[model samples]
Target: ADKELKFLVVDDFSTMRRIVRNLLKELGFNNVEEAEDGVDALNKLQAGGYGFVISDWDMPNMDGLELLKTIRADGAMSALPVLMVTAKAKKENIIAAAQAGASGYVVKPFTAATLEEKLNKIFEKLGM
Candidate 1:
């Protein structure tokens, strides 16, 4: 993967967004940005140059699932990698996310190691 690949970390909680941003930095990805919710995320994405998305499922205004669906629906960024990192670990939630075209999913309370692994998995699959 390119070291300069841009990443968008979206979550309602500032703490979770910071954690993901720091983990990406530790993995040698410094071009990272944060968004408070799905609306915020879409705004940043419209600014262009985003290569990946890591989002929380539960958020005000718009949730991660809706965000994922919107992204998938758009032709411009339809194939962009979207990784769901949320506390909603139910089988139904996971299935819904998969059907919505999320590139990957990670439950909350995850470690930096898990984040790194998932990132690498997507990177590899995408031939980044």
Candidate 2:
């Protein structure tokens, strides 16, 4: 079942992380983990078993865009989907994330519609 699928949600703020987690739960996703920032997220990623990611662009240490690029470059997680969950959606930022091979981008605080669209994009692109 989709509920059994695992995810990693990365953000610097507990409030935002909790919001994302709650939203995911609203959509029937219960298996979720949180990483305070990109660094911790990467560590968890290396430890493995995480098949998906939801992240923010503005974060301390390695930010979402950098994290996306790194994931794209890393051989093991190269094809994994990294969805951007952030407030900054400037044209340039969008272009950069796309160029970095982001699965999709999200602007929060988001509606179920935006979340669902991007969620479908990730699943469809990743063939999940």
Candidate 3:
């Protein structure tokens, strides 16, 4: 991915937020911003130029699932790529997210490589 493409890291926990942000930087993407949860994510997204979202499944205010649904529903933002990370390993949850138009889903125990490849795939599909 281009270094120019901006990313949003949305997680309630500060540790996770920094970890993801630092990981993203380590992956050569330094153009990133953080959000506390889905609500904060949406606020930053609305301000514009966010090409991607890396969000946690569980959060206060709105969860990742709810955020995904809202992003899918918005006509202008519907095509935005969202990669949701969940600790849950339920097939039903994956199925529902797929049906709801999520770009990608990652369960826990995943490495940073998984996130990068998935992001690459999403942009690859988008012709970016």
Candidate 4:
């Protein structure tokens, strides 16, 4: 899966990006790239070949919710898997993310185990 799947990790904070990237690598996902915000993520998505997206919510230029909506609306990238990795743990936020077509959601301050569970659950649901 690591060799075949390419992931884009989007976050405004470089430290958070590094943490996510390193965590993914430790989980056997090596083909990962970092994006500072949703706009950067969108550019990378348009460039093609990204199989998965892990995005932060409160980003500048374009937020994760908007980015998720954009991806769901675009025919070319509508089916791309998006796992929201955000600090917004409120119920409303979770509902909004689900409505916007997120493949999975993970709150911030998560452990590697939590990340693995979310990813695996998404994969199971998608039959990946």
**RMSD values, in order shown:** 1.7, 1.9, 2.0, 1.8
Q: Name every residue pair that clashes in candidate 1.
A: none
lDDT of 1 by residue, 49-120 (tens): 998999989889999999999999989999989998767544337789888888988888677788888988
**Overall local distance difference test of candidate 1:** 0.88
* Model 3 misplaced stretches (Cα beyond 4 Å): 1-3, 88-92
Instruction: Rank all candidate structures by their lDDT, best first, as comma-separated numbers.
Output: 1, 4, 2, 3
lDDT string for model 3 (1-128, tens) is 34478989888988878888887887889999999999999999999888888888788999888999998898788988888888754433677788888887776545678778887888778776
Worst lDDT run of 10 residues, candidate 4, spans 85-94
Q: Estimate each model's TM-score.
A: 0.92, 0.88, 0.87, 0.91
Task: Enumerate clash totals for all models, in the order shown.
Answer: 0, 0, 0, 0
For TM-score, the strongest prediction is: 1
Ten contiguous residues minimizing lDDT sum, candidate 3: 87-96
Better of 2 and 4 by TM-score: 4
